[model samples]
Target: SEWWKEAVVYQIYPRSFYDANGDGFGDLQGVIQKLDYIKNLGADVIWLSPVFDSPQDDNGYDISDYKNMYEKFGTNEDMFQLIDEVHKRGMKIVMDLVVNHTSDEHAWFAESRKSKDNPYRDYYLWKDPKPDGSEPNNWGSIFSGSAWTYDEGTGQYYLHYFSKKQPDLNWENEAVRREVYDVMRFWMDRGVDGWRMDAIGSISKYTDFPDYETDHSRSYIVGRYHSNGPRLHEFIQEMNREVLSHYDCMTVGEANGSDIEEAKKYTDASRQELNMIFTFEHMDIDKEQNSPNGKWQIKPFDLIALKKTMTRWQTGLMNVGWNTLYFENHDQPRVISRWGNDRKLRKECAKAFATVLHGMKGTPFIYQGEEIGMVNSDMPLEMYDDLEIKNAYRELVVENKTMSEKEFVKAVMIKGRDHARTPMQWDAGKHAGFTAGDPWIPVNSRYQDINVKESLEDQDSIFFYYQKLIQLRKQYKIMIYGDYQLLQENDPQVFSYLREYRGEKLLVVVNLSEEKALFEAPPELIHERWKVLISNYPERADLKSISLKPYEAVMGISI
Candidate 1:
């Protein structure tokens, strides 16, 4: 198996990770300072969120200059030093590549918008307004507005799937493809290991630009018209043949609307597009529906639905594609708070979630602060910092009064992305030791007890348990290459599965609920001699019908 197939990736959100110079914002030097901590936790690679020069429209996702580092992050030399330092510690660094769009302030977009006759005019997607003086199409932006923004100077509208400040690139243009390839080579030659391609599936958009049926609301369904376009495969194959094939690095495509079939085409080794892909199917398990307006609407998490979704992907891609296992990222609420009992059984449920995710058939990613059971923040709307959350609140509550203030706050507490963007809780000091000055965002109020310093001192803490989990992945080949089979398919309270490799088999059982649950040993493993390998609770000798404590997880190897 490839190294990345067995590797554990740690994701760092730079602005909130650590502030080395007390600038109240994390920099490259801060990441270098925490290298030892990450290495000690058994992470083999670090995936840094976008640090490229930007106007901060979407927290660095709107890139103005791809070749230069963000001023707040550091200089070009500092970035090189970080790459060297990370390599010295036997780890790799992956940069975030946001090529689906460029900031409107980017030089290419500026030139394209100056005049219709300019050479860069075709670098962006622009269309003339309709006879009714409306947007080019009914597509909607992910940031809560029309996808088309009319430019008075050029007398045309440019497409923006996200914020208007971010304009979609014209991937259909040959010159645009060359520019992206050069950008890839720029970092590869500088020793950067790999790339976490952001919004990759949105690059190739439908050329017809047809309007969709709208509910006369603030937004229109856009993903069905933009995601996984017809020429997506051809473009990716060209990218592989031109640039990616020359590099010995892993690539993970961020595919939001992809299914198992689409994912196979994007990641199959023969396709040469990417090493793996991040799908949002599992993440949408608790969402009420795919509402074009926002994600504020949520439903109770269904365990059986989640299991079926995950199992289908695992089995569907068993021979053709690879997967990426994760429970939380910068764009979602903390897993412990979203799905588990954060106030009462945070630690136990966090570990149980980890066991279920890491035991799956894929490379696992650990979000910053997830190891110590960090949870969603309960701050009021006035204290939140994310653009999406604030906009949704203003539109739904302040202006339209579609929901009560209490209901809005409740929704934000459950599904807001700002919950994961709070400053990392390093210690119980002012600002949670994340910075010397006031942080860009407020720290979680519970940092006094849930900080990392406390976890480091306690042997039974979640941090050490994560360390052991990572070590287990490295120590056993079966953990990486084993065939997975779901057991107790109808049990909503207990999640059980088996991983088998050759003649060796391992059983993993997790009580996903917050109540004591009864688990009946599977017939195949009931009489077989088994030895406890790992468990959140003390090992018990009984393998027959057993009562499991809330959030208990156990792994046993056949003897």
Candidate 2:
């Protein structure tokens, strides 16, 4: 059986995880120092996000070299040693494989742009501007600007999905495919167990890029013309057959544009394309088409929508493939602050959110500091350094004539990508005990009161609560590979589900409201003797009846 099917993943942002050299940034040596802390948390795998050599633009997603680590982070030898340490503890290491694009400073891109007839010229997508002196196509970069950047040397513009410095690769060329496979082999051969393929759905595009009609009729970068393009699966199948097939490794694609069915095709077990995929559907609710710039004017989300979304994923991919679940990651805001109520009773509310997501039917991915209930930091605009935030401030608030700078920052505080990238809070001393000297970025103000050290000591802390869930996941087979069923979807304030496995039954009930909600289960529905496995609020689960406190979750097993 696949090890990741039920394993919990701990995502570590290398630059913010730990700093061993204390160069004011995190590095491999820092991660090595915290292996024991991670192991004790019960994570079977540590997903390191982009430790490869880069200029630090886009936080290391823009790669300048494929085979080596950035000097600031550490050396390839250090990475190998880290892998060895993880393996020794019976844990696996998964590294990000950013193949969709490369930094403009990459050797191949540098050589390719030198001349039109250069042998490497076809390695990336480049074209002359239209006769009207406009972009080659209507496509826009995700960073809220023109997707094409003019290179004076070649007198041509290259396509980039993110930033001008990060040029998109031309996967139509067979040579590029083989080169990426080689890069995959390089890491796998060095003992890395798996890969998190970045932007896999955008790997290939239509041969003739076309313009996309927008709902607003405003001409922005048209992504539909290229996202989840025709040649996406063809290239993925080739990669699986050529390189990934040779190793006993897990691969999860960062496919933002693909749908549930299309994503399932990549991880169908029999298809041998990918082990699983990272779907952005649930994460995109705050910034849907009409509610651009993370401002959702509607009232808070209802339990019905929440239940429908959750049950759709569970039932949709139940037998076809696997699903990857998460509440927070490097590119998203804190879950407790965003989804759950993060006001006066922060810990209680956070524990409720954790219990709900962990008891779901998918491989749980926990971002660093999430287990201790970290809240999104409300930093001044001048202090924000994330490119996405800066771009949004310029585009939405400044240029588009919508909200003001203050409004932009306020809205983004609850939905900004930088919220999860802040320095990890290890202790309650100066700089949240993250650094001896000044930190590259400001630490959250609540670090002193909510650091990991404090949580580890408190029996009812979020950290210990997650620890218990992890232990239960490993000890019980039913929780790992059980069949999922959604019991209720129309409830306005409560979310409920049922899971069944070899002669075992489990029920999970959650109250997504701010006030107490009464949930009644028929005596026949839970006839067998039952006990509460875990709960967000203090309560007994004798199965006779139960009352769900405000924003509380409970898991019970029928004996």
Candidate 3:
């Protein structure tokens, strides 16, 4: 059975989760220590970010070896111990599989780059540089640089879609594909239940490597030819057949440049490529790609657009495929700042946002620190440690001077995904209880007043409210596999939806406004048995007429 359909996943960025050794960085034992806290949150599965051996470039996305844990994290035995602990709690574990590339320091790449005739030479994509000794192709690495890095020793340039130190693997080689399968088997045998396939869409690149013309040379180079290449599905299906089919597991691909139609084929249970996918479309809803400087200007999305997009997945896929729902992840800024009105009324807004997304008809994923209503951290550009943010700031802020440091920092805080990567806030004490010394990154300042220990004791805290939401979702089929329909499509300040299963019906209403908004359930939705099940408001949701205060959310059940 595809158990993921019934699972609620929690993502833990291991390095930022908890530090057990007081080493200023979180480790495997740190995660082991939080197993009960995670289980208490009602998360059925944990998707941990990369913890493999690495040089820390791209935060362990650049793997030095497929089989070993980085010393900073722990030994291979420590990983196994954590897996045992998670399974002992009856929870599942999934790891980040960074298969698209490997650290240039990897043995395979080291041997492959030695000379064209080296036995491992076919492991990576290599080509001769252009006539003027420049990069071989017009492709740009995702991390603000040429995609091709010249190697004087080999007299060839290798392709790297992100950092130059991370060389792209050659998928055309069957040997390479087999190695990836072996790596999967290594972890699966150790009891991991699944993998979050990172950049799986980038595994297959256009063989011809043709250049596309565009005004922004960088955009053209980065996206035009590399993403969702011709053989993407072919490779994934091959992986599914060889590596994934042998085990009962969950797989979620980080897919981009692919449409719902294309995604459907991969996720459909019958095809078995992946259980679900993470699409950037919903995340990019507030951005306009054509805008100057690529600054995010919030674009209003009404209930109808949201319903249409979601229902497209629900109805279109039906019994064929499943969906992975999420509000924020590692690669995103805090949802509270990006989409919620949490800054003014933290509890109400956080609960409201949770109600709408949790009640939707998909397997919801909760990122770490979200349950306690964590907000985005404020960091000056000089304090920014994320490679992507730093590169963007250098190009768009420092060199161009198109925006002041304050303006740039504000924009980065608002849109930079790194804000979410800051250290987790565990308590009101120094370093937010994340470390004994200075953290690798700063903890959000509000940790002093907002944290897990405090919220866990407060019955009405956001953390407890999220627990109630999870319980409701588990108790009612209507909240899990129900049919969803939008009630208010045109109202910009409200997002409302109805869920129906068999004879049970539920309506979830949220005021996305900063001020009080008057709202009424549609005539079809009104029922004599309408009773409040959960609410974020301090006041009762008892109703003849419903008046939502700022950032309020309530869920009602109908007989």
In lDDT terms, which candidate is top? Answer: 1
The residue ranges of model 2 lying beyond 4 angstroms of the native Cα positions read 215-217, 291-299, 522-524
Give per-model TM-scores.
0.98, 0.97, 0.94
What digit string (tens of lDDT, one per residue) describes model 3 on residues 1-559? 2468778899999889998998889899999999999899999899999999999888899999889999989999999999999999999999999999999989999899988899889899998877998777677777765788888898999999988888999999999999999999999998999999998889998888887666862442566477788888889889989988899899999886656786787788777589888877667666656443454334543445555666566566655677778878988888778766556688788887788788787788999988999888876666777787777667656765545676667667787777778888889999889999778888887898889989988998999998888888788878778777777666767777778889877888788767777677777655446768888876554443478888888888876
Stretches off by above 4 angstroms in model 1 are 214-219, 398-402
The candidate 3 region of ten consecutive residues with least summed lDDT is 292-301
Model 3 misplaced stretches (Cα beyond 4 Å): 216-220, 291-319, 399-406, 538-545
Query: RMSD in angstroms, all models?
Result: 1.4, 1.7, 2.3
Tens-digit lDDT track for model 2 on 469-531?
Answer: 898888777787788887655678777777888988888887877888767775557566777
lDDT, model 2 = 0.82
Q: List the residue pairs that clash in candidate 2.
A: 140-221
Query: Could you give me the TM-score of model 3 versus the true structure?
Result: 0.94
- Evaluated at residue 51, the lDDT of candidate 3 is 96
Q: Rank the candidates by TM-score, best first.
A: 1, 2, 3
Model 3 CA lDDT for position 399: 69
